[PDB]
Scaffold this active site. Sequence first.
Site, PDB file in Angstrom:
ATOM      1  N   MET A   1       0.758  -1.218   0.249  1.00  0.00           N
ATOM      2  CA  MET A   1      -0.207   0.167  -0.064  1.00  0.00           C
ATOM      3  C   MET A   1       0.778   1.286  -0.004  1.00  0.00           C
ATOM      4  O   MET A   1       1.746   1.140   0.487  1.00  0.00           O
ATOM      5  CB  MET A   1      -0.952  -0.091   1.366  1.00  0.00           C
ATOM      6  CG  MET A   1      -1.728   1.206   1.432  1.00  0.00           C
ATOM      7  SD  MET A   1      -2.878   1.295   2.563  1.00  0.00           S
ATOM      8  CE  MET A   1      -1.899   1.698   4.137  1.00  0.00           C
TER       9      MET A   1
ATOM     10  N   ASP B   1      -0.131   5.685  -1.316  1.00  0.00           N
ATOM     11  CA  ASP B   1      -0.727   7.031  -1.445  1.00  0.00           C
ATOM     12  C   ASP B   1      -2.404   6.807  -1.306  1.00  0.00           C
ATOM     13  O   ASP B   1      -2.684   5.839  -1.972  1.00  0.00           O
ATOM     14  CB  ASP B   1      -0.534   7.742  -2.891  1.00  0.00           C
ATOM     15  CG  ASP B   1       0.927   7.842  -3.214  1.00  0.00           C
ATOM     16  OD1 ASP B   1       1.797   6.970  -2.498  1.00  0.00           O
ATOM     17  OD2 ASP B   1       1.379   8.912  -4.016  1.00  0.00           O
TER      18      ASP B   1
ATOM     19  N   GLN C   1      -3.461   3.354  -3.122  1.00  0.00           N
ATOM     20  CA  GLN C   1      -2.728   2.683  -4.253  1.00  0.00           C
ATOM     21  C   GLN C   1      -2.539   1.217  -3.539  1.00  0.00           C
ATOM     22  O   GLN C   1      -1.848   1.170  -2.544  1.00  0.00           O
ATOM     23  CB  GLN C   1      -1.397   3.275  -4.351  1.00  0.00           C
ATOM     24  CG  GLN C   1      -1.367   4.828  -5.026  1.00  0.00           C
ATOM     25  CD  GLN C   1      -1.803   5.106  -6.309  1.00  0.00           C
ATOM     26  OE1 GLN C   1      -2.677   4.240  -6.899  1.00  0.00           O
ATOM     27  NE2 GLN C   1      -0.541   5.249  -7.193  1.00  0.00           N
TER      28      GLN C   1
ATOM     29  N   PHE D   1      -3.244   4.909 -11.181  1.00  0.00           N
ATOM     30  CA  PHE D   1      -2.454   5.675 -10.138  1.00  0.00           C
ATOM     31  C   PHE D   1      -3.253   6.685  -9.409  1.00  0.00           C
ATOM     32  O   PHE D   1      -4.406   6.778  -9.127  1.00  0.00           O
ATOM     33  CB  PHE D   1      -1.427   6.719 -10.775  1.00  0.00           C
ATOM     34  CG  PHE D   1      -0.202   5.596 -11.279  1.00  0.00           C
ATOM     35  CD1 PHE D   1       0.056   4.536 -11.493  1.00  0.00           C
ATOM     36  CD2 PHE D   1       1.051   6.588 -11.395  1.00  0.00           C
ATOM     37  CE1 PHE D   1       1.138   3.751 -11.804  1.00  0.00           C
ATOM     38  CE2 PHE D   1       2.404   5.825 -11.533  1.00  0.00           C
ATOM     39  CZ  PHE D   1       2.189   4.448 -11.856  1.00  0.00           C
ATOM     40  N   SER D   2      -2.508   7.297  -8.246  1.00  0.00           N
ATOM     41  CA  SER D   2      -3.342   8.325  -7.509  1.00  0.00           C
ATOM     42  C   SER D   2      -4.252   9.411  -8.059  1.00  0.00           C
ATOM     43  O   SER D   2      -4.080   9.712  -9.097  1.00  0.00           O
ATOM     44  CB  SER D   2      -2.130   8.992  -6.587  1.00  0.00           C
ATOM     45  OG  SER D   2      -1.353   8.109  -5.575  1.00  0.00           O
TER      46      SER D   2
ATOM     47  N   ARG E   1       0.445  13.809 -12.985  1.00  0.00           N
ATOM     48  CA  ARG E   1      -0.254  12.974 -11.868  1.00  0.00           C
ATOM     49  C   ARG E   1      -0.762  13.542 -10.617  1.00  0.00           C
ATOM     50  O   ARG E   1      -0.378  14.926 -10.454  1.00  0.00           O
ATOM     51  CB  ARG E   1       0.697  11.824 -11.730  1.00  0.00           C
ATOM     52  CG  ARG E   1       1.773  12.202 -11.294  1.00  0.00           C
ATOM     53  CD  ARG E   1       2.856  10.802 -10.655  1.00  0.00           C
ATOM     54  NE  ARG E   1       3.359  10.255 -12.061  1.00  0.00           N
ATOM     55  CZ  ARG E   1       4.052   9.020 -11.964  1.00  0.00           C
ATOM     56  NH1 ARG E   1       4.622   8.642 -10.850  1.00  0.00           N
ATOM     57  NH2 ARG E   1       4.295   8.493 -13.311  1.00  0.00           N
ATOM     58  N   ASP E   2      -1.549  12.842  -9.774  1.00  0.00           N
ATOM     59  CA  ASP E   2      -1.921  13.200  -8.515  1.00  0.00           C
ATOM     60  C   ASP E   2      -3.133  14.348  -8.545  1.00  0.00           C
ATOM     61  O   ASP E   2      -2.659  15.131  -7.831  1.00  0.00           O
ATOM     62  CB  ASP E   2      -0.834  13.391  -7.538  1.00  0.00           C
ATOM     63  CG  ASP E   2       0.110  12.441  -7.500  1.00  0.00           C
ATOM     64  OD1 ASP E   2       0.132  11.331  -7.896  1.00  0.00           O
ATOM     65  OD2 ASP E   2       1.527  12.770  -7.029  1.00  0.00           O
TER      66      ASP E   2
END
Lengths: 509, 509, 509
Positions: free
Chosen positions: C17, C19, C37, C79-80, C147-148
């Site tokens: 594990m 974010d 994640q 992804f995040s 990202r994010d």
Amino acid sequence: ETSDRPLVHFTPNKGWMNDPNGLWYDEKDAKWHLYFQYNPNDTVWGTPLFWGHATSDDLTNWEDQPIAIAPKRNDSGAFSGSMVVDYNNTSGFFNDTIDPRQRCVAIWTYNTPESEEQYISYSLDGGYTFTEYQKNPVLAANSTQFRDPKVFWYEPSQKWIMTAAKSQDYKIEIYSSDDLKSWKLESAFANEGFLGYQYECPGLIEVPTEQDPSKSYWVMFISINPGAPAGGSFNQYFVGSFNGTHFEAFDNQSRVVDFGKDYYALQTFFNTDPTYGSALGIAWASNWEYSAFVPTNPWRSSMSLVRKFSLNTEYQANPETELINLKAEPILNISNAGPWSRFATNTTLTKANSYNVDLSNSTGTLEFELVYAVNTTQTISKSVFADLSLWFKGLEDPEEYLRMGFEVSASSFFLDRGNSKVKFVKENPYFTNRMSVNNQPFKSENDLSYYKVYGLLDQNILELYFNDGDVVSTNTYFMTTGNALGSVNMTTGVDNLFYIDKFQVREVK
Amino acid sequence: ETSDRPLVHFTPNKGWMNDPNGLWYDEKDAKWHLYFQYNPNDTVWGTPLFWGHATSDDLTNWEDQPIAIAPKRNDSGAFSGSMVVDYNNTSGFFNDTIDPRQRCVAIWTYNTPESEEQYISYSLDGGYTFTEYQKNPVLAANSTQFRDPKVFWYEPSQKWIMTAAKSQDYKIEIYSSDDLKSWKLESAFANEGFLGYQYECPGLIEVPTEQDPSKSYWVMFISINPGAPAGGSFNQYFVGSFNGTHFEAFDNQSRVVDFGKDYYALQTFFNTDPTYGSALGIAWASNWEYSAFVPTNPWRSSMSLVRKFSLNTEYQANPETELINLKAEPILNISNAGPWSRFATNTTLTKANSYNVDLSNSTGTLEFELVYAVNTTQTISKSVFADLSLWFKGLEDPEEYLRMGFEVSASSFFLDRGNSKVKFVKENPYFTNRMSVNNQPFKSENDLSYYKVYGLLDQNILELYFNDGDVVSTNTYFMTTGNALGSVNMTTGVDNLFYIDKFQVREVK
Amino acid sequence: ETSDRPLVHFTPNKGWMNDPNGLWYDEKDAKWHLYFQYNPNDTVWGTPLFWGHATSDDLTNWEDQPIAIAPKRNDSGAFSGSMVVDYNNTSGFFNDTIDPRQRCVAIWTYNTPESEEQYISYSLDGGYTFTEYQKNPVLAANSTQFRDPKVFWYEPSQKWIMTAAKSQDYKIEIYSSDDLKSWKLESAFANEGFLGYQYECPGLIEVPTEQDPSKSYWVMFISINPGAPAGGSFNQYFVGSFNGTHFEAFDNQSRVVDFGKDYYALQTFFNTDPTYGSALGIAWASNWEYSAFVPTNPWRSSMSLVRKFSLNTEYQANPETELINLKAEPILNISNAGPWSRFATNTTLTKANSYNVDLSNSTGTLEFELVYAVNTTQTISKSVFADLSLWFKGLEDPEEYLRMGFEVSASSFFLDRGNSKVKFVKENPYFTNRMSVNNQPFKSENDLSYYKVYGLLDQNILELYFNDGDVVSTNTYFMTTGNALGSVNMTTGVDNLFYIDKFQVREVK
């Protein structure tokens, strides 16, 4: 897995025991009756609490009997009390079908969370089964601290006399009734001391004087707990006179029945077979401080031996004056025993060399007879521990032993029930390891002071009888199970002081 | 090689000490005077026996002084006794050059192999040097058991009153004189009990009532040895009234001054500095059974602390009734100490978790203040040892420790001065390992019972003060020299029973 | 050989594990949603990478749920990203059938070995299963690493505002949309004090003030990594101004979120239950330098506790002019409440002695509350360590402990998470064992400066809250499987420097 069980002291089959109850004797059946506070369920004290029942015909060997008395409630308990024989049916319970010598009336304290009161019960089969009186209580004083009724017959005034304890009022009230269902307060005595915390299990009996059997004085027994001077529980007595209502001790004075740590709630029998000859009394051999934690299974607690009481008016308390002293002699039907083993018969034993007999397969129960003598003149000596010591070592494991003897400088007979194992002995902060007695000589021949000691060891209990019961000590001891204390050793410090007149040991069953 | 020496209890520099003697206070010099039975030669009791002398101005710190009294003979000894201040020169020893406040008269028993008699001595320098009265004895009763004269001034009858013991006659005779050299027998008291073997060191003092100071009753102190109920020696008391000749206790009743094993021959001061305020009493902290074998060098025996006496009329002896109880509060000029360390302040402890503070360099002398509370309702619980225990472990070697605390089922405060080493503790059959007290609560907040304990450890001695001295216990302890008992641990059984209101420990000098 | 598993921090069922993702609250069913994640195959990071799902209604006790978002390729990863509740259907998804407050839209990065696009997905069963938007991606390119994405609602401009990290260009881009399907670039951020550093997991939330919860300031969260040579992974925040397109940082208003070494990838909830009242945030409690080598099985990584953020406009400390300070308070619901165990309260600490509570059967999850004061008075402070230290050890094996406390000379709170026999602590050279924090006193009354510190220990994670969250420090620690820091100890250098107002420990389940 069971423990080692005393052979000549009464224990219940399983469960928990305390105060001895309803002591009486069946004349026509030749049976001694022992009742006791009994919890059959757990192995500690708890409610419901019953009157257990055991019979004997020699006071040394017992037969178990069904529970004698039970409380109506689980909340409650059938606490301590005594029995009487109503020869002349003064209670009106007994037909002419019931023998006069067999007319049992139990008098007992019914303890309930709300109050403590006095009840009575009767038996039609010789003291095995008991029915309550239809209108119980027969005495209620609106209290939660009112218990332990001991009752006797007083010829002159033609009454039953009950001595019972107003426990936390430090008062022991005296009641009278011809009927036995109606009780009248006659007097209260008093604030005797040592008080402690409570007055429990009072007793009142004529005890025949020694040397004059014909004469006798009255003795008042009070047991107190907690708050004994030695800590916890103990039994005190008073010597004096009884007029029919009031009791007065010859002087303001405290005295103890047993100097040992384990002797409580002494009750005397209502009648005896003489032969044996009343006064006769038995007691619960333990101390409330640690009574519930002793390592025995599936039972807990033994009774002491039954003892023949007599008053010794000429007891040399010290070398100047004499006091009226209570004398307690053991009742033990030896049954089958022997042979004796002996030591330094008529010798003056010396530090360098020491005596031993080990009885390679003693059952753990044995008795010994010792008569020693201090030199007295002169030998001086101090700063040196001047002792005559007996060691009951062995037998699977010595180093686990009880030591006892006399030291001159202390003028006291010591006991060391430590050593060891049995974590309980190692860990329980209430289980005292050591106590003394301060026994006195019985005669003085040509500069030697003679002391005598009889002792009986029964697996887990030791009783010492100084000068044939002028002084007594009762202490329980716990060794590492299965064996044995058969290695008997005599020892001394100081090359020339103690004279052994006699020492004998033998196995007892 | 020396032993660990108590820091705030008096011990002699070298030699042997017992009974405290001639206690008095110099008003103009502000000096407390302590005299004592003293054998400077050996480290045990022996004749010649002297009056040792030590002075203090706070009763906690002492200065050694030259021997105060000596017997003419080696055979003989200058035994126990007391002092008085003859303000009005009733003896005629003192000029107008000697201050009234400084007029010392020692009254003491001259024990010789042939007889025991009473002598007097006077001092012209404030109680350091003493000369005999030219015509001693001032009292002879043709006896070998006649000793320990304690004397006070009785205003109403304008007399000196001497209470002295006819030891083996179990009699304490009261004498009177306005002169101090001619004594007149007024009364005898009596056969009080417990008798034991002897009456020793009697004392008679007005003790102010607690709650009301203005009032006071008379207290009679008797110490007996051998033959104490707990074995050996102990100090008893009586509360009552004094008319000028006879003493009567309010009731026939025995009570003990100190429940500990080491507290004997208590004498009260003749006068005090109030401030402190009489009655004030000190005692010899030991037990004759094993007093001569304790592992200390080059001295033996410590005194207890001086205690402020007061009578508590409303002491809850049990939950029903109240008794007139003697209260003894400690006198300790703390001097320089701190800081406190504390534990479970206002928490209820659980068996799972336990508390500890170890004071890494405690001198071995420390005091603690503990106020705990039993749940009372209800929690039931039995067959499980329900204790709150304090452990003074450490410090060079734990596993050598003293344990103390309270168990609910016993309702008594226990002490375990075994554990260990110290061959004398492991071997001496008179050195008791364990004793209890049976202390009572002081108040109950809703569904709780509050008990308080103050305790002081001083290297080889422990004093416990239950409810500010309503009950006291004095016991000596011997650990393996050089350290320390600094590891202070609290422990419990049964998860939810004890509530710690307060617990504090600190080092004391 | 599972390992000790945190009891009040979230960990996956099994596997890796990192974010936290898509944080929001279901107002209808009263459920907090936590996504993360997730690699359910191996116990380290790898593809396919999924969105793990877990629910809770008290943010303390969690419930495992099936995977919420999955990549179409085992080659790629999901992804995040964040989530939004679209009450007003501005997305175009959602029937009248689906409750307004149950219309969650996930915005996330679909990272491929070839490309890196921005996808959105809707859920119709309230966030348990998700369906992708049919015309993905919603953002075309370049894409230099992009990202994010953190998305929030903006009332004034009536737009979804999205803040995303541009790692290659060391920026944070802001995008706007009302459709949610098409985004327009608006601005970028920022200093620039750290460039070459990688920007990750940005967030933009209005944080309420203390002393006035009505006011609020815009706070920009950035996760900065790393440079191992440099301090390493840290979570940073900027207090500033947001007009609706641009973010203005107030110069000199910027600190790290958590001073610990294991607190990274912080994301705030989109909506909360107040009650707790947003801003609320949770973080991945680990560090990229060694997170893949920690000894946990069969899972790796715990999340931190959820924290209620608030701005403390009056802070000072330094005596230098005050600045807006972020304070995070823990969200922790206690099931097994009580009982406290405490040390010395209202007390001065000396070097010579130490405190101890031995929590014998604690699981290794406990909380503590320390309030100490440093005596500024004089106590000049020579060059010797002036520490107040707390110690946790054993229980099965001490010598394996974690140390923490305050050293005066250095004016900071240290933590030594070394002292473990565990291989990955002895061996792993990137796992730093020592940190200090620099807490500031809340009260400076008299000559004492008062400091407060609350701490929670959870098997492998420690979180320290200073002055109720004014400063925080989160560090994981590893100690041999099974047992368990239960021996709580307090120690100090310097004899008279530290006053303990309050210390208390308690178990948490």
